[PDB]
Amino acid sequence: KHSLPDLPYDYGALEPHINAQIMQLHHSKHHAAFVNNLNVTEEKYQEALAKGDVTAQIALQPALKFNGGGHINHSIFWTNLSPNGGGEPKGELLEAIKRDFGSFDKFKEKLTAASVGVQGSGWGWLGFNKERGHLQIAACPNQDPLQGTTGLIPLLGIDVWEHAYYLQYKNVRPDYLKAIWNVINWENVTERYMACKK
Amino acid sequence: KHSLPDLPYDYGALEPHINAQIMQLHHSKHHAAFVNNLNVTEEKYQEALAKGDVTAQIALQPALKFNGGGHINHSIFWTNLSPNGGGEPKGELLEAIKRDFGSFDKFKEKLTAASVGVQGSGWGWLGFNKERGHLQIAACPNQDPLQGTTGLIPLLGIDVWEHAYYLQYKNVRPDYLKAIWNVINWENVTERYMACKK
Amino acid sequence: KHSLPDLPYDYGALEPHINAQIMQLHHSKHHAAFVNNLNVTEEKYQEALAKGDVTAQIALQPALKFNGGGHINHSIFWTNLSPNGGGEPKGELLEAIKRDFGSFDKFKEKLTAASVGVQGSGWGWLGFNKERGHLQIAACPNQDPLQGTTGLIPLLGIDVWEHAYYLQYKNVRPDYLKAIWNVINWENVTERYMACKK
Amino acid sequence: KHSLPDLPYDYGALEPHINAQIMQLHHSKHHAAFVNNLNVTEEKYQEALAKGDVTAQIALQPALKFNGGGHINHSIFWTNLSPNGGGEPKGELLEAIKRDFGSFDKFKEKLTAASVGVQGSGWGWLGFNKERGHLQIAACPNQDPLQGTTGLIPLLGIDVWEHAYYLQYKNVRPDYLKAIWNVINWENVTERYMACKK
Ligand SMILES: [Mn+2]
Ligand SMILES: [Mn+2]
Ligand SMILES: [Mn+2]
Ligand SMILES: [Mn+2]
């Protein structure tokens, strides 16, 4: 079974950028809903798998992808943020971003464009392509996890569901996007980059 | 060509079930953004169709369905809501909700369950199947409209995008559902049934 | 594990309607490919499920839906056909078709229209809706199984992939559709209807 | 407005790798059906756009992308095939296939694997990413064209719909793949690279 992990900071440590009412809620409600549904569904999968029931397996695919991706997606999201966040990353990570996007600001503009373009619920991502050996930007719908659905390795993600900035920025998604860069834990993004730089 | 329709009531006429902020933001900011972007899209479309560009016609599709449906979907919504609605309809429409869904009991439950079940942004609909002559409950993702995508005639629709209840009801989608049944304009729901009960 | 079931007739028992070169091939090659992939994938599912790996689970969803649906779909397909097929069904099944589609020929025209309209690979289906208590016609893409993906109970299906009539009818799909009605095992379609008439 | 382009060679010029029947049927029956239905669709489109009908514009979309892309996809295909092609390209394009995919060895393998992997009807593509200035291997479902759906510039495309190899190669898709490499017009593949190597 899975569990809800604690945050590496407080519910209000991301203020004024990300409201505390949003943070506690995004964690305790939304993210918590995900892990339980994930556990219930996973067991309903074990029931039909041993049973040899393919119809049941297939019927359980959407719930499993939604709650499972919700789990995976948000878990990586928390570690991407930090009260000691913002600025430009350093070392090899910044060189890769330069080698692949020209500069840090060109990279910023694009991840902003891809996240602001998601119609309905989705996520903006910065991923490492293990095969071609370079960084890519991708957008995923609802809770579809980046790696499970694309093979790209998730370095940095931006939750652009309306429950992630509405209480604060309302229908204005670019304001939230302008702000998110000030709480980004580049320590972690580099950390995830070293693991797959293999 | 397309105009933001005026609400047939004041921004706070549906209070307490839907607070005045949500209606103002929904109508003014969201619905309006669809009209404005639909206009630019159809204009960009005449341009590509005119100079036989099929790659541009295809690339423009996502935006047209999104903004086009956003405008279609919300204009309906405003007419389905009303200060003096709620409860139950009057025989003919009720006579139908009866026969096709058991009773208003199970009809509410059916629509509530379709709406609550949407993963991410979407809508729950009570439509009319003009072939079969039967009522149907259909859920559309994002801003995909009933008719254009499924062929069903829209009678009553419930927006379940998070911008429709988050400020008030927050994370509890089902709370937004039990409360919406109060502002439902059964008079208008009936109006759509009649023009198609043929 | 799963296996390839034998046909309730010979590879040429459906001539002149369905070629024998098509029949043996559709079974021994296409259908056989499905069951093995189904078994390999199912075990790769058990590996990651016990491991608690959600990324792997999600990555294996498409193969599992395609080979699993391919298995389910074709298995029902064989029992739908018969050298002693064709004509109109009798008893309750025909009354239901009349009560839901007006007549047998109106039903025929529609299942023909839905199967001839599939763009790319897909299946035409006649299903029983357990909840609304009546027959419906639906079309599914590639190998997506009807019940697992819609809840409808599969009574009769028409494989409209190009590997199902090309050697014989070439790009002409309606000819194959005109012919398929002459080998339809209505004994079985009624049989599947009794089970869900519950 | 749209015309069925004439083949730049005889229906049997690519023999023995693609037999004369397949080319005749592909070009004459399939490709033609797309042109004819694309024309009727765009005409139906001007009509709905003209009288501000957004429901009809949306309902017409599936057909436009299907026939529109069918015409786009095949017209390319004919120019990518040729009596005297095969082997390897000449430096500039080869210089690129080298850098981005390792070597022609792994480039063939990469495209072959993308094509063989399609579930149902589709295409494998070698495109140009005009931002990154890099070559990319992309697979499109049904008749969804590269550019209109992904933004990549199409350089070389392999049809994997069953009507492209079934009469000859039958169920063995990979046999059709190893054989197609022989008729590949590297001269034309180069032609598309040049106009975009900017
Ligand atoms: Mn979230
Ligand atoms: Mn809305
Ligand atoms: Mn088949
Ligand atoms: Mn083709």
UniProtKB/Swiss-Prot annotation, chains A, B, C, D:
Catalytic activities: 2 superoxide + 2 H(+) = H2O2 + O2
EC number: 1.15.1.1
Domain of life of the organism encoding this protein: Eukaryota
Chief subcellular location: mitochondrion
Protein name: Superoxide dismutase [Mn], mitochondrial
Disorder named in the UniProt entry: Microvascular complications of diabetes 6: Pathological conditions that develop in numerous tissues and organs as a consequence of diabetes mellitus. They include diabetic retinopathy, diabetic nephropathy leading to end-stage renal disease, and diabetic neuropathy. Diabetic retinopathy remains the major cause of new-onset blindness among diabetic adults. It is characterized by vascular permeability and increased tissue ischemia and angiogenesis.
Binding-site list for Mn(2+): 26, 74, 159, 163
Protein keywords: Acetylation, Manganese, Metal-binding, Mitochondrion, Nitration, Oxidoreductase, Transit peptide, Ubl conjugation
Induction field: Expression is regulated by KRIT1.
One BP term from GO: response to gamma radiation
Encoding gene (name): SOD2
GO terms, molecular function: DNA binding; enzyme binding; identical protein binding; manganese ion binding; oxygen binding; superoxide dismutase activity
Organism of provenance: Homo sapiens (Human)
